[PDB]
Structure formats: C-alpha cells, structure tokens
Amino acid sequence: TDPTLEWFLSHCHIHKYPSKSTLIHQGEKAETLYYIVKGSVAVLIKDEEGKEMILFYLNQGDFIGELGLFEEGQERSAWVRAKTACEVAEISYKKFRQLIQVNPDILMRLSAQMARRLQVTSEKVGNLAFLDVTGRIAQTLLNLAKQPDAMTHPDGMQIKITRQEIGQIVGCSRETVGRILKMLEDQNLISAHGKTIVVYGT
Amino acid sequence: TDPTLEWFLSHCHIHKYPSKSTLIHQGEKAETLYYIVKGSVAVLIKDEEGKEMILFYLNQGDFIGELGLFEEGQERSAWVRAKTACEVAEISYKKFRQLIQVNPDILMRLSAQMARRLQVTSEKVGNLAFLDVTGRIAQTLLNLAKQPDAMTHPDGMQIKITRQEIGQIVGCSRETVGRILKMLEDQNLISAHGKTIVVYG
Ligand SMILES: Nc1ncnc2c1ncn2[C@@H]1O[C@@H]2COP(=O)(O)O[C@H]2[C@H]1O
Ligand SMILES: Nc1ncnc2c1ncn2[C@@H]1O[C@@H]2COP(=O)(O)O[C@H]2[C@H]1O
Ligand SMILES: Nc1ncnc2c1ncn2[C@@H]1O[C@@H]2COP(=O)(O)O[C@H]2[C@H]1O
Ligand SMILES: Nc1ncnc2c1ncn2[C@@H]1O[C@@H]2COP(=O)(O)O[C@H]2[C@H]1O
DSSP: OOHHHHHHHTTSEEEEEOTTOEEEOTTSBOOEEEEEEEOOEEEEEEOTTSOEEEEEEEOTTOEESOTTTTSTTOBOOSEEEESSOEEEEEEEHHHHHHHHHHOTHHHHHHHHHHHHHHHHHHHHHHHHHHOOHHHHHHHHHHHHHTSTTOEEETTEEEEEOOHHHHHHHHTSOHHHHHHHHHHHHHTTSEEOOTTEEEEEOO | OOHHHHHHHTTOEEEEEOTTOEEEOTTOBOOEEEEEEEOEEEEEEEOTTOOEEEEEEEETTOEESOTTSSSTTOBOOSEEEESSOEEEEEEEHHHHHHHHHHOTHHHHHHHHHHHHHHHHHHHHHHHHHHOOHHHHHHHHHHHHHTSTTOEEETTEEEEEOOHHHHHHHHTOOHHHHHHHHHHHHHTTSEEEETTEEEEEO
C-alpha cells in the first residue's frame, strides 16, 4: 500500500460533503490544505455577469487549496464545488509545513500535481488564444476521449457529457454547444447518440 | 544575502545567453533545472501555424524548466527565449533532488513560484474567456504602465512596446493591435508617440 499517504492522512481531519457542495469559497483567506480521499470536484472561476468557467476537474488522489500554502495572507484563487459526494482530508498549512521537514516527498507529490495543472492550464490558454468556438469544442471532445473514463466504441472513444458542461469548459452557452455538436455530426467527426458522444478516429 | 540561495547556486553551473537566444525548446527531454541570476526571459507557446503566445515573463530570481522535475521522461512544455542578455544558473534534476532531501526549503521556494504561476495563468484563462480583444489590450496597457520600467510622463505613464508583442500577449494580429490603439487615441485614453505609448492615468 502507501505508508506515506497513510502517514499523511493520520495528521488530517476527514470530512464528507454531499454532491454540489462548495468546498472552497473564492476570496477567502487560505490557511488550510485539502486532499480528496473519495469523489471528484470541479474548480471554477466566474465572470462579472455570473458566468462560470470550469478550470479543472480533480478526483481521488488530488490535493486542493494548495496555492495559498507558500505565502501568508493569500486568498483562495477559485471556487471548488463537490461534483459527487466527497470524502475530504484537511490539515493546516502550519502543520503541513512541519510534515514537509520530516518527509519532503509529500511536498513533491503536491508540486507534481501543480506542475501537471500548470501544463494543462497553459494548454487551455493556447486553445482560447488560437481557436474559435468550433475548434475549442473539438479539442475538448478529443481530450475527454483521452480520459480513462472514456468507454471503448467500434467507431472511436465514447464519452458521456452534458452540453451545459461542455459550455462551461470552452466558454460558451449550452445552446451554442448543441448547434456545434450537430455540425460535427454532419461533418462525420462525432456521433450524438442520445446520452453519449462517440468521438471518431480517437 | 541569502544562505539557502547561495547554498543552492554553489551547486549550479552558470551559463550566459545573449539576447534573443532560446534556453529551452518545447519537446526537449527535461533533465535540467534553471535559475535566472540576471536578465529576463519570455515563456511562450506556438500554434500549428506558427502564431506565438506569451505565457509569462520571468526575471532575476525565477527558476525555469521545473515542470519536468517531478516525473521522469517528461518533455519541455514550452519555449523560453532570452528577452535580454542572461546570466543563468543550471543544475541536473538528479543533483537537485538531493538538495531537496538535505534542505526542503529550496523546494518550498521553487513550489512557491509554481503556485503564483498557476494563479496568474488561471487569471489569464479568465482574461481570454471573458474579454474581447479590445478589453485585453486596455488591461494590458494598464498593467504595463504599472510596471517599474514605466517611465514617468506629464500626461500619465509611458511604456515602450511593439504591436507585435502586444498581439503575442493578448492573442491577435499586429494589424488588430494597431486598429484598437487608434481607437484608444480617439477616445483620448492613450497616445502613440512613436515607439512608446503614453497611458493617460
Ligand atoms: N488552473 C487550475 N488547475 C487546477 N487546480 C486549480 C486551478 N486554479 C485553481 N485551482 C485549485 O483551486 C483551489 C482554490 O483555492 P487555492 O488557491 O487555495 O487552491 C486552488 C487550487 O487547488
Ligand atoms: N464567454 C462566455 N459566453 C457564454 N457563456 C459562458 C462564457 N464563459 C463561460 N460561460 C458559461 O458557460 C456555461 C455553459 O452553459 P449555460 O448556458 O449553462 O451557462 C454558461 C456560462 O455560465
Ligand atoms: N504558464 C507558465 N507560467 C510560467 N512559466 C511557465 C509556464 N508554462 C511553462 N513555463 C516554463 O516553461 C518552461 C519550459 O519547460 P519545462 O516544462 O521544463 O518548465 C517550464 C516552465 O518553467
Ligand atoms: N489569435 C491570434 N491571431 C493572430 N496572431 C496571434 C494570435 N495569437 C497569438 N498571435 C501572435 O501575435 C503576434 C502579433 O503580431 P504578428 O501579426 O506579427 O504575429 C502574431 C502572432 O504570432
């Protein structure tokens, strides 16, 4: 098994949250670090009109609220809401700074996740800068197809995903998502089989 | 004037890069960490057609090429180009991982810069998703006029930047930048005094 996590978790409080609950309130003062024992979450930023953007999906095995760890007086950089019911560990920054001196691997794992997040977020900047809505929705589909949650299909990878949520990822209305998907079918690039979406040539 | 940082540099091998040189190409196998002693660099990504986007500006006191540190077999995720002449400290991941075990403070310092970079890059995501090109150019000029290299001017603040570099930051053609600037002058919000730009306010 993993003694390091075990060791890490023995210094945490664990708490459970129902689906759709807000784990992190943007703007708040950061003093605590979190680790997802079970579940999945969305990280998201808002427009001044209430519009929500989904930055990132995090799951079992992810730290959360780590960005304020390295400087005192930081505030949460974004919102995090419980995608499913979650089981979440919690430890203060101070205590977590102490664990680091005993075993820096826990910091390595955390920074490993920051590095990954930075790479992917950077790619998202690129999509936003270089691609129109159509292009962005295509890359979004290709990426979801590459996920392990992607069911295998004769014609390609099969994903299940809401239009609304596709909109929150690329930054457009769900109506716009729908019209674009319908065009991608016509172009014979995907299929919209009721619930799922089959991404051809994946 | 910093015990840990010197301690860190003492293990580094220094290299100098002339302006406009590329320290890191995207795709390379990551096996080295960098630290900027002097100078400034641009981190950027290219598009399949060659269009360039500036992700971040890094300066004296910034690690570079740290994203490949935590997993092996990784590849450099972007290009880093010398914006000026640079004095850069360098060290292998292998030897760097040992510095961590000896003193994890050096990791905390590294990780602290990574944290900031994620916040600012997520902010950029917001910028691009919620603001039209006009919006982004305005915001950009403001941010530039709040810089320390922002010379002072009686009408406001003055900055020196090309339209090319403005489009690389906000993601538009240099012909788009020009057109938007003309409009900002029309609104008496800036002045195109040749090379430089006066930002009223
Ligand atoms: N671009 C991103 N990719 C992944 N996780 C993010 C991103 N932006 C913010 N987060 C997470 O959102 C959390 C909310 O507040 P913190 O800044 O405390 O810590 C944050 C990060 O863990
Ligand atoms: N630039 C944008 N234009 C429209 N909706 C956006 C934008 N950026 C983010 N969104 C969000 O994306 C969501 C997708 O579908 P909704 O109609 O539910 O509501 C949408 C908005 O909240
Ligand atoms: N969004 C970003 N903000 C700051 N620095 C970045 C960003 N994206 C990439 N870099 C730097 O670009 C470097 C090039 O390759 P690495 O992945 O080795 O390490 C990278 C980071 O140091
Ligand atoms: N979406 C974009 N459209 C056009 N140029 C872009 C875009 N995103 C980044 N760029 C870059 O921005 C640069 C600014 O001026 P150029 O026309 O010289 O070349 C441009 C491109 O390399």
